[PDB]
Design an enzyme around this catalytic site. Structure first.
Site, mmCIF file in Angstrom:
data_model
loop_
_atom_site.group_PDB
_atom_site.id
_atom_site.type_symbol
_atom_site.label_atom_id
_atom_site.label_comp_id
_atom_site.label_asym_id
_atom_site.label_seq_id
_atom_site.Cartn_x
_atom_site.Cartn_y
_atom_site.Cartn_z
ATOM 1 N N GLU A 35 3.663 10.243 3.715
ATOM 2 C CA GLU A 35 3.088 9.185 3.426
ATOM 3 C C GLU A 35 1.961 8.916 3.385
ATOM 4 O O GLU A 35 1.403 8.166 2.726
ATOM 5 C CB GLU A 35 4.314 7.499 3.313
ATOM 6 C CG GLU A 35 5.953 8.599 2.563
ATOM 7 C CD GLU A 35 5.630 8.381 0.983
ATOM 8 O OE1 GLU A 35 4.825 8.162 0.499
ATOM 9 O OE2 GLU A 35 6.901 9.445 0.643
ATOM 10 N N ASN A 46 -1.003 5.049 -8.501
ATOM 11 C CA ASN A 46 0.277 5.526 -8.877
ATOM 12 C C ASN A 46 -0.735 6.050 -10.115
ATOM 13 O O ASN A 46 -0.915 5.028 -11.233
ATOM 14 C CB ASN A 46 1.148 5.211 -8.778
ATOM 15 C CG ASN A 46 2.272 4.982 -7.918
ATOM 16 O OD1 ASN A 46 2.571 4.282 -7.140
ATOM 17 N ND2 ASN A 46 1.658 6.164 -6.459
ATOM 18 N N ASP A 48 0.464 5.336 -12.992
ATOM 19 C CA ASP A 48 1.175 4.272 -13.431
ATOM 20 C C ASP A 48 0.168 3.511 -13.515
ATOM 21 O O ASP A 48 1.299 2.390 -14.507
ATOM 22 C CB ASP A 48 2.640 4.277 -13.979
ATOM 23 C CG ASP A 48 3.288 3.112 -12.669
ATOM 24 O OD1 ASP A 48 2.612 3.676 -11.045
ATOM 25 O OD2 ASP A 48 4.719 3.273 -12.258
ATOM 26 N N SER A 50 0.797 1.022 -10.840
ATOM 27 C CA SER A 50 1.329 0.612 -9.909
ATOM 28 C C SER A 50 0.836 0.920 -9.111
ATOM 29 O O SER A 50 -0.676 2.030 -8.388
ATOM 30 C CB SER A 50 2.368 0.960 -9.987
ATOM 31 O OG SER A 50 2.318 2.363 -10.102
ATOM 32 N N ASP A 52 1.123 1.869 -4.342
ATOM 33 C CA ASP A 52 2.130 1.735 -2.759
ATOM 34 C C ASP A 52 1.064 1.608 -1.661
ATOM 35 O O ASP A 52 0.085 1.678 -1.761
ATOM 36 C CB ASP A 52 1.936 3.644 -2.951
ATOM 37 C CG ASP A 52 2.710 4.625 -3.655
ATOM 38 O OD1 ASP A 52 3.591 3.716 -4.482
ATOM 39 O OD2 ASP A 52 3.293 5.673 -3.837
ATOM 40 N N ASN A 59 5.739 0.678 -3.412
ATOM 41 C CA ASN A 59 5.477 0.468 -4.714
ATOM 42 C C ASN A 59 5.767 -0.529 -4.938
ATOM 43 O O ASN A 59 6.695 -0.915 -5.136
ATOM 44 C CB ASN A 59 5.905 1.718 -5.984
ATOM 45 C CG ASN A 59 5.077 2.164 -7.121
ATOM 46 O OD1 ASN A 59 6.333 1.433 -8.161
ATOM 47 N ND2 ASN A 59 4.792 3.582 -6.684
HETATM 48 CL CL LIG Z 1 8.224 2.993 -2.947
HETATM 49 NA NA NA Z 2 -1.229 -1.478 -8.495
HETATM 50 NA NA NA Z 3 -3.683 6.942 2.454
#
Ligand SMILES: [Cl-]
Ligand code: NA
Ligand code: NA
Ligand SMILES: [Cl-]
Ligand SMILES: [Cl-]
Ligand SMILES: [Cl-]
Ligand code: NA
Ligand code: NA
Ligand code: NA
Ligand code: NA
Ligand code: NA
Ligand code: NA
Length: 129
Positions: A35, A46, A48, A50, A52, A59
């Site tokens: 990750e 992301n 959309d 959002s 992370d 998220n």
């Molecule tokens: Cl998440």
């Molecule tokens: Na954001």
């Molecule tokens: Na990264």
């Protein structure tokens, strides 16, 4: 902060992740590797809108507030910036909520695709925990 493998494993264990909801420590370390490359400051946008955040790429759509994800929730009741700290407490506490929500570690796409079903114990091999 960029953690080493055993360093993060030790921190995760102290924060109560070892076998949390049945997921052995190696699962969490494996997830963090893919990750965030063990980097607490990791952010990724992301499609959309959002974002992370942090070592487990939590998220903003559901879990934290970043003030720029319209219609989102903040189910961990934290600013997303708290998830970027060298202190992993906020990330761990929020991860416990996520992993308890019904789908287990499948919440983490990288875990599903790269860790699930693999020899995850390899991630903690050689570590003095
Ligand atoms: Cl998440
Ligand atoms: Na954001
Ligand atoms: Na990264
Ligand atoms: Cl393990
Ligand atoms: Cl928002
Ligand atoms: Cl599960
Ligand atoms: Na760094
Ligand atoms: Na489980
Ligand atoms: Na970043
Ligand atoms: Na983090
Ligand atoms: Na995180
Ligand atoms: Na929010």
């Amino acid at each position: 902060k960029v953690f080493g493998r055993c360093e993060l494993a030790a921190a995760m264990k102290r924060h109560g992740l070892d076998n949390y909801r049945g997921y052995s420590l190696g699962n969490w370390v494996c997830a963090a590797k893919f990750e965030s490359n063990f980097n607490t400051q990791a952010t990724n946008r992301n499609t959309d809108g959002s974002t992370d955040y942090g070592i487990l790429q939590i998220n903003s759509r559901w879990w934290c507030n970043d003030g720029r994800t319209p219609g989102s929730r903040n189910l961990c009741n934290i600013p997303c910036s708290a998830l970027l700290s060298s202190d992993i407490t906020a990330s761990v506490n929020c991860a416990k909520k996520i992993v308890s929500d019904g789908n287990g570690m499948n919440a983490w796409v990288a875990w599903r695709n790269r860790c699930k079903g693999t020899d995850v114990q390899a991630w903690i091999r050689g570590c003095r925990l």
